[PDB]
Amino acid sequence: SWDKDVYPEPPRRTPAPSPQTSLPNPITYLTKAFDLLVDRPVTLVREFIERQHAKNKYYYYHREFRRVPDITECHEKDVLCMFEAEMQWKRDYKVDQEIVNIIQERLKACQQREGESHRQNCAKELQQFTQVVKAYQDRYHDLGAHYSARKCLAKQKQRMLAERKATKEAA
């Protein structure tokens, strides 16, 4: 499976039907025929493959890193300091795109689960989604295509400088 903290669901609910008819229920006949025709040979196939790979194993590890300090603690030129700093920043940009992908997956999940009961029990996800995407719009958006890391720093200085000057002369 996965981590149900990070890919959560609402709890499952199933109601019990109750005929009120005496046909009785042809789809029950068909799902029992499906179970006995299909579900047992598929289970035997996966069980054989389970044993055949349960003989011997491999492994793989998720790659982790150290931390280079920052771009701001490199000098004017620093060809080999900025290299580490900017590739670390670009890997953060990659993992951050995938964070936005995961949050949009959650939003689509709440849309398709709740049916037409949207605005009850999905406003939490739209709220946190507009939160995280307002952060992304503020930070990574208007930096063009030849981003390295330095334009992000210039946009950062520009944004906090404009907000500081606005709140100072309106304070």
Partner: protein, 59 residues
């Protein structure tokens, strides 16, 4: 006859082997607008009734 239902069954077997295992291990995947429980019915897993709709009058 037998050629026809093996022509139908071997894609059922292949795609149901595919649709259980890899599709289930991928988390946000096949998802459902849930079945619609009713204020007189009960739950299969937990199990209790919802109280019914109230009095009728002028029905």
């Amino acid at each position: 006859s037998i050629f026809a239902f093996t022509h139908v069954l071997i894609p059922v077997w292949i795609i149901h082997y595919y649709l259980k295992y890899h599709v289930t291990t991928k988390p946000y995947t096949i998802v459902e607008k849930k079945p619609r429980i009713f204020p007189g019915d009960t739950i299969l897993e937990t199990g209790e009734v919802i109280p019914p709709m109230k009095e009728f009058p002028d029905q």
